[PDB]
C-alpha cells in the first residue's frame, strides 16, 4: 500500500482520490493519503472552495515513483511532484503516519468498483493522451480541449484522444459509402482496432479514461470521446462476442458510479437511446440496459 504525502493544505479544498472525496479546511493539519492500493492507476483531484472553477487533478501509478503534493502560491494550485530521494521520502511518510496526519484510502474489501472502472487503463497510455514527458504523472483539468475539439487552441495542453468522425474518409471506404456509414464494422475492426489501437484492451482503456476525465473533471471533450467510442461499437453489426460482453460490464460500472444528479451533464440522450434501442447491439448490453432503465428512465 502506497502513500501520497502533502506538504500542507494552505487553501480550503475538496480533495478527490479515485471515487472518494473529502473536505480540507484552510490551514488544516492535512498531510496526505495513505493505504493506496497498488496495482491500479489512480487520480487525485481538487476543487478549490473559493473558486469551484478549474477542477483539476493528476493521474499517477505509485509503482512508477514517489509522488507528493505541494501547494504553489504563485500558480495557485496543488501540484504533484516526484521525490527522487527515496530515503527522504520514506522518512517523511513515516513521520506523518506516526502523527496520524493522513487519511486512509477507504477501500471496502467487497468492493471492486475502482478495478472495474480502470481495468484496461494503463499509465503508459494515459501519458500518450496527455503529453508532458518530463513527469511520470499526468495533469488533467475541466477546461483542457481534445485534438478533435481544436480541429473544429494550445497544443501542449491538449487531450490527444484518437479522432473518431463517422463522416470522414477514414470512416468510409470509396465505393462502400452506404455500407460503411450504416454499418461501422470496417471502421471499428479494421481502421480502429487492427490499425490504430492494435487490440480491444487499448480501445477500452481509452474509453474508460475518457469517461473518468468527463466525470471527475467535468471535461466536455472527454464526454464526447466516451460517447463516440460507445456509439462506434453499438453501430457495428460485426463485433467480437467477448468485446460486447466486456463493453456491457464496462458501461454497467460507469453508469453505476455516475452521480445521480450529474446524469444531465454526463449522459447524451441521443447516443444512449440509439445504442440501447435502435442499434445493431440493442440486445447485447443486458446489464447496462437494466441499470440505465432503473436509474435514469427519464433520459429514455
Amino acid at each position: 500500500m502506497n502513500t501520497v504525502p502533502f506538504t500542507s493544505a494552505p487553501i480550503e479544498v475538496t480533495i478527490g482520490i479515485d471515487q472518494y472525496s473529502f473536505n480540507v479546511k484552510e490551514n488544516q493539519p492535512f498531510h496526505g493519503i495513505k493505504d493506496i492500493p497498488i496495482g491500479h492507476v489512480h487520480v487525485i483531484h481538487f476543487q478549490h472552495a473559493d473558486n469551484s472553477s478549474m477542477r483539476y487533478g493528476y493521474w499517477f501509478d505509485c509503482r512508477m515513483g514517489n509522488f507528493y503534493i505541494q501547494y504553489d502560491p504563485k500558480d495557485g494550485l496543488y501540484k504533484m511532484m516526484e521525490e527522487r530521494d527515496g530515503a527522504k521520502f520514506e522518512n517523511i511518510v513515516h513521520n506523518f503516519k506516526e502523527r496520524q496526519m493522513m487519511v486512509s484510502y477507504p477501500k471496502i474489501d467487497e468492493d471492486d468498483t475502482w478495478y472495474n472502472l480502470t481495468e484496461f487503463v494503463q499509465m503508459d497510455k494515459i501519458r500518450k493522451i496527455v503529453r508532458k514527458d518530463e513527469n511520470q504523472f499526468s495533469y488533467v483539468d475541466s477546461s483542457m480541449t481534445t485534438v478533435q475539439e481544436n480541429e473544429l487552441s494550445d497544443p501542449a495542453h491538449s487531450l490527444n484522444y484518437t479522432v473518431i468522425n463517422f463522416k470522414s474518409r477514414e470512416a468510409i471506404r470509396p465505393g462502400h459509402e452506404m455500407e460503411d456509414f450504416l454499418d461501422k464494422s470496417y471502421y471499428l475492426n479494421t481502421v480502429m482496432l487492427q490499425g490504430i489501437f492494435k487490440n480491444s484492451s487499448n480501445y477500452f482503456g481509452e474509453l474508460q479514461f475518457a469517461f473518468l476525465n468527463a466525470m471527475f473533471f467535468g471535461n466536455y471533450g472527454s464526454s464526447l470521446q466516451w460517447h463516440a467510442m460507445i456509439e462506434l461499437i453499438c453501430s457495428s453489426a460485426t463485433v467480437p462476442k467477448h468485446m460486447l460482453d466486456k463493453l456491457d460490464e464496462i458501461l454497467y460500472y460507469q453508469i453505476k458510479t455516475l452521480p445521480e444528479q450529474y446524469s444531465d451533464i454526463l449522459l447524451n440522450e441521443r447516443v444512449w437511446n440509439i445504442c440501447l434501442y435502435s442499434s445493431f447491439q440493442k440486445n447485447s448490453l443486458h446489464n447496462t440496459e437494466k441499470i440505465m432503465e432503473n436509474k435514469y428512465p427519464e433520459l429514455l
Binding site: 463522416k167 470522414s168 474518409r169 468510409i172 459509402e177 452506404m178 456509414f181
Partner: protein, 237 residues
C-alpha cells in the same frame, strides 16, 4: 446553412449550384396478389438535378433493374441518388462543378455528404422551401423519356426552354415553380390551361409551349387561379 425565403436570391447569383430532388427516384404501383396480399411493382424513376440559374436539368433515369434483389429500397434510393449526383460532379470539369448542392429533402443530407467527402469545398445544404419538383413527371416529354428507358440513361434538358433570352433567371424559376405547383395541385386542369389553344405549339426542342410575353401573363394568371381554386375546393373556403 439552410436555404429559405430570406436568402432566396442567392439561387441566381454567379456561384454554380444545383438543386437535387429525389422524390421520383423510387416509384411503385401497389397491387393485390392472387392470394390477396399486397405487393409493389417498381417503375422507372429519375433524379431531378437542376441548375436554377441556367435551367440546365441533368435528368438521370433510374431503371427498375437497379432495384433487383435489393432490400430496404426507400433507403437505398437515397444512397443511389447520392451516388449518381457524386458521379455527375466528378464527370464535370472543375470549373463547371457546383459550389453548393441544395437537397429538397433533409434525408438526402447524410447520403450526399458521405458520397461527396472527396469534395470538402462543396456545401451540401437543405432548404425550408417546399418546392414542387415532384411534379416533374407531369411534364410530358420528361415522363416519356423516363417510362421508355430500357437501361440507365442520363438525358439533358433546359427546363426554361428559351425563356432566358427574354427574362431573368429569378423570373424563370418563379414561372417554373408556379407551373409545377399547378401541375401538382391539379394536373388535368393545368395541362388543359397549357394546351387549350392549338395555335400555340411546343417546339420539338422545348418542354413548354411557345407563349408570347403577353400570353405568359395570361397563362400565369390562369395558373394562380387554378391553385387558388383548388385551395378553395380542398379547404371548403
Amino acid at each position: 446553412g439552410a436555404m429559405n425565403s430570406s436568402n432566396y436570391a442567392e439561387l441566381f447569383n454567379n456561384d454554380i449550384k444545383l438543386f437535387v430532388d429525389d422524390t421520383n427516384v423510387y416509384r411503385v404501383t401497389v397491387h393485390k396478389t392472387f392470394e390477396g396480399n399486397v405487393a409493389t411493382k417498381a417503375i422507372n424513376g429519375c433524379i431531378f438535378t437542376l441548375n436554377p440559374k441556367t435551367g440546365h436539368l441533368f435528368l438521370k433515369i433510374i431503371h427498375t433493374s437497379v432495384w433487383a434483389g435489393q432490400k430496404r429500397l426507400s433507403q437505398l434510393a437515397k444512397w443511389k441518388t447520392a451516388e449518381e449526383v457524386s458521379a455527375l460532379v466528378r464527370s464535370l470539369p472543375k470549373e463547371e462543378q457546383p459550389k453548393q448542392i441544395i437537397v429538397t429533402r433533409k434525408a438526402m443530407l447524410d447520403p450526399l455528404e458521405v458520397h461527396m467527402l472527396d469534395f470538402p469545398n462543396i456545401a451540401i445544404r437543405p432548404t425550408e422551401l417546399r418546392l414542387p419538383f415532384s411534379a416533374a413527371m407531369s411534364i410530358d416529354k420528361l415522363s416519356d423519356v423516363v417510362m421508355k428507358a430500357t437501361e440507365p440513361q442520363m438525358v439533358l434538358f433546359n427546363i426554361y426552354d428559351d425563356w432566358l433570352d427574354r427574362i431573368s433567371s429569378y423570373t424563370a424559376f418563379s414561372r417554373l415553380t408556379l407551373l409545377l405547383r399547378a401541375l401538382k395541385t391539379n394536373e388535368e386542369s393545368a395541362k388543359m390551361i397549357l394546351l387549350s389553344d392549338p395555335t400555340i405549339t411546343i417546339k420539338s426542342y422545348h418542354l413548354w409551349p411557345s407563349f408570347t410575353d403577353e400570353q405568359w401573363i395570361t397563362i400565369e394568371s390562369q395558373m394562380r387561379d387554378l391553385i387558388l381554386t383548388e385551395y378553395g375546393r380542398k379547404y371548403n373556403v
